[PDB]
Amino acid sequence: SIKIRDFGLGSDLISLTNKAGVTISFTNLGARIVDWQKDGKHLILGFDSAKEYLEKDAYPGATVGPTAGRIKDGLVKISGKDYILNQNEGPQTLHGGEESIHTKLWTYEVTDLGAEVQVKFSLVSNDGTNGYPGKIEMSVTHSFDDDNKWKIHYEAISDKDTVFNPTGHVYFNLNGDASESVENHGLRLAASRFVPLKDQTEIVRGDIVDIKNTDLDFRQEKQLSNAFNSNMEQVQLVKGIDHPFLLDQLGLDKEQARLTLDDTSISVFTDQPSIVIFTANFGDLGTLYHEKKQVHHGGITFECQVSPGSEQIPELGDISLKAGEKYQATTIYSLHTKL
Amino acid sequence: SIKIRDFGLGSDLISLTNKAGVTISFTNLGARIVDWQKDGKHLILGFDSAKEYLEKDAYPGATVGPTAGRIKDGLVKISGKDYILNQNEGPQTLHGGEESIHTKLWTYEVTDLGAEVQVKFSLVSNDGTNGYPGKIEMSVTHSFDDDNKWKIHYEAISDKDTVFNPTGHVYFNLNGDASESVENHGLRLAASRFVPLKDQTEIVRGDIVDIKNTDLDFRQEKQLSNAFNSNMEQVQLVKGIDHPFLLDQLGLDKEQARLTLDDTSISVFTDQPSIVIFTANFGDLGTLYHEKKQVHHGGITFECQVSPGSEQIPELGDISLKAGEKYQATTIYSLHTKLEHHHHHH
Numbered sequence: 001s002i003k004i005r006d007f008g009l010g011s012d013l014i015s016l017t018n019k020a021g022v023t024i025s026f027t028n029l030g031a032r033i034v035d036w037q038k039d040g041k042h043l044i045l046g047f048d049s050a051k052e053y054l055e056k057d058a059y060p061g062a063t064v065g066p067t068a069g070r071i072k073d074g075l076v077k078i079s080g081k082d083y084i085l086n087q088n089e090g091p092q093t094l095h096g097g098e099e100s101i102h103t104k105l106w107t108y109e110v111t112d113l114g115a116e117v118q119v120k121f122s123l124v125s126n127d128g129t130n131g132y133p134g135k136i137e138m139s140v141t142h143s144f145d146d147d148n149k150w151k152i153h154y155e156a157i158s159d160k161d162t163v164f165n166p167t168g169h170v171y172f173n174l175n176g177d178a179s180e181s182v183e184n185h186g187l188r189l190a191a192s193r194f195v196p197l198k199d200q201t202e203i204v205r206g207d208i209v210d211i212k213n214t215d216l217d218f219r220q221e222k223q224l225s226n227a228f229n230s231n232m233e234q235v236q237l238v239k240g241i242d243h244p245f246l247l248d249q250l251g252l253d254k255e256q257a258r259l260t261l262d263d264t265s266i267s268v269f270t271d272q273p274s275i276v277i278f279t280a281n282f283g284d285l286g287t288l289y290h291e292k293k294q295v296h297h298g299g300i301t302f303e304c305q306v307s308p309g310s311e312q313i314p315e316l317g318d319i320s321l322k323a324g325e326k327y328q329a330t331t332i333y334s335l336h337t338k339l
Numbered sequence: 340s341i342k343i344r345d346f347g348l349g350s351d352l353i354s355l356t357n358k359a360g361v362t363i364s365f366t367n368l369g370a371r372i373v374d375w376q377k378d379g380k381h382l383i384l385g386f387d388s389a390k391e392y393l394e395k396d397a398y399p400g401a402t403v404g405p406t407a408g409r410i411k412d413g414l415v416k417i418s419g420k421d422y423i424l425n426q427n428e429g430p431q432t433l434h435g436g437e438e439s440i441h442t443k444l445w446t447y448e449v450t451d452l453g454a455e456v457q458v459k460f461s462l463v464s465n466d467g468t469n470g471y472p473g474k475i476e477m478s479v480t481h482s483f484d485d486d487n488k489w490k491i492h493y494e495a496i497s498d499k500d501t502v503f504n505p506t507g508h509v510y511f512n513l514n515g516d517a518s519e520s521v522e523n524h525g526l527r528l529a530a531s532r533f534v535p536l537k538d539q540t541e542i543v544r545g546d547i548v549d550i551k552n553t554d555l556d557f558r559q560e561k562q563l564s565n566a567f568n569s570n571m572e573q574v575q576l577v578k579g580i581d582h583p584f585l586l587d588q589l590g591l592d593k594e595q596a597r598l599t600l601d602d603t604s605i606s607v608f609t610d611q612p613s614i615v616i617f618t619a620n621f622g623d624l625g626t627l628y629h630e631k632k633q634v635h636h637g638g639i640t641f642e643c644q645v646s647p648g649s650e651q652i653p654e655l656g657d658i659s660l661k662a663g664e665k666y667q668a669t670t671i672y673s674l675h676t677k678l679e680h681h682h683h684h685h
């Protein structure tokens with residue numbers, strides 16, 4: 001079934017329930033996922049109204065872009081030219097700059113295919129917006145099916161050469177409660193390398209590091225507490241994880257990661273080369289989710305995209321988008337329950 | 340009463356009814372007026388869904404900006420600096436550029452004050468959007484009261500020195516039918532001068548001309564047909580009216596314009612210096628409004644703003660907005676019945 005309701009400030013909440021009784025819900029405010037629940041338990045973090053996102057934290061569940069992550073000094077080179085983007089975290093451009101696409105109301109259309117239902121959000125980023133050349137016509141399609149698969153499909157076309165590398169910022173918490181650390185979750189991740197951070201500013205350090213046989217090697221399922229209790233300077237630097245992991249094998253058919261808690265597991269698939277993992281290292285911040293005070297490590301992301309820092313480490317890839325080329329990206333979060 | 344429902348594409352329709360029974364409705368798509376009815380008759384032009392605006396004509400009833408009108412070659416000078424804005428009409432920047440504010444979903448909140456209901460729409464124009472320095476935090480409040488006054492109040496604050504001069508693009512048609520020309524309406528307008536356009540590109544000619552005693556003189560009420568039938572160069576150039584009229588006396592207290600048909604009148608008040616009047620000179624385009632094919636001259640706007648062309652004619656005003664400085668503008672459209680005797684035939 002599909003249900004639409006006012007979510008506040010003019011935004012809508014679109015809720016989809018599949019044959020299995022699973023419920024996923026989205027909002028046009030930032031083309032974002034608000035909730036995902038089974039047998040009355042939330043699997044992800046989210047608020048109860050649009051206002052909360054705007055007042056508390058606008059990132060959770062959102063489509064962030066045009067470029068996800070931190071860009072050093074807000075500087076990108078486009079066709080040999082330097083461009084300075086909006087700086088909203090010191091001199092860095094973080095998540096597209098201030099008042100970015102995650103804070104705008106996107107238009108949308110719902111398509112019911114029976115076994116699958118799609119919600120297509122659209123937004124136009126005007127040329128020059130936050131320093132980005134455009135116009136960029138963007139669309140993010142969130143779909144949910146009877147097999148419990150939640151798919152995100154991105155598309156974009158720009159009038160001018162520009163940069164483009166968005167991501168979905170959902171935070172998972174299989175505890176179904178923010179006051180509970182995800183340290184008890186087990187994680188498996190098909191990556192043998194990562195990108196270390198320079199320092200507290202979180203810009204990249206400059207190198208690519210082999211993680212095999214370290215507290216961060218999750219090639220084999222392991223409990224998060226491990227990483228969390230690690231003494232690796234990188235863990236100690238951010239007080240958890242807040243890094244880009246490089247996938248060993250690319251392609252949508254490969255399960256790239258898996259988050260497990262008891263009977264319940266989330267599998268991640270993507271056509272992207274990297275997954276940025278952030279473990280809600282907010283300390284005592286205590287953001288309120290459903291009346292529950294969030295704890296340090298009370299969430300974890302799987303931001304699939306081209307690794308941040310390609311400006312300094314070209315091996316990471318290239319986020320350029322040439323005029324007229326069609327950008328496409330796909331990320332899938334599949335839900336399973338052991339019998 | 341206040342009612343709300345989805346209007347299409349994720350936009351909403353907000354419908355108000357005052358104690359007199361008059362109904363007016365707005366959409367967050369472009370902080371825009373959708374309809375205004377008296378006794379079941381439309382007083383303005385509008386569509387029945389969001390998609391129509393997007394597919395037919397996205398300007399009607401909309402909030403347009405950040406700068407309303409045409410800017411020659413998209414060139415503005417901001418604090419000694421030259422800036423080129425998005426050019427969407429040939430080399431011209433028309434109504435803020437392509438995919439401007441009238442095309443966005445604004446957030447909003449409704450305030451019920453009893454005799455008055457306010458709908459405040461908000462949007463942020465990011466720094467650099469369409470070439471405009473910012474960021475600009477904007478807000479448009481549309482309100483309707485028991486006295487049948489529909490008021491528009493604009494507010495804005497920029498992080499950087501920029502330009503700002505928005506307007507409301509409603510189209511009136513007291514016939515309540517797009518297929519009926521407004522040549523039968525009576526118009527009274529407190530303006531002695533106008534701004535001629537250079538040519539078909541519609542940029543300003545460069546001079547200000549006195550229109551007293553010509554077919555464009557509406558100081559004393561006259562039928563619109565007088566203008567439409569005129570062979571004055573300016574009328575012929577645009578095939579009707581599409582010009583800024585400079586108000587003779589400024590201030591929100593004064594009735595600047597009055598449009599009448601039979602027993603119905605719409606009065607215009609504003610704190611702005613000019614009113615740009617466009618009479619839907621679309622020829623045979625025939626855009627469908629409620630299944631009625633619109634006729635040439637099937638509508639008239641009263642876009643109150645600082646006149647377009649100030650870039651070339653400094654005398655017109657200055658639309659610059661300094662960083663941190665609060666912009667405010669107020670325009671009011673009031674509805675009246677039997678304000679005067681208007682009994683004509685066409």
Ligand SMILES: O[C@@H]1[C@@H](O)[C@@H](O)OC[C@@H]1O
Pocket residue numbers: 059202242243276277278301303
């Ligand atoms: O530092 C993290 C960033 O890496 C990402 O995960 O989004 C949230 C935080 O700002």
Ligand SMILES: O[C@@H]1[C@@H](O)[C@@H](O)OC[C@@H]1O
Pocket residue numbers: 398408581582615616617640642
């Ligand atoms: O030419 C007119 C313009 O002057 C304004 O009134 O909006 C509609 C058309 O673009």
Ligand code: NA
Pocket residue numbers: 005006010011012344345349350351
């Ligand atoms: Na809505």
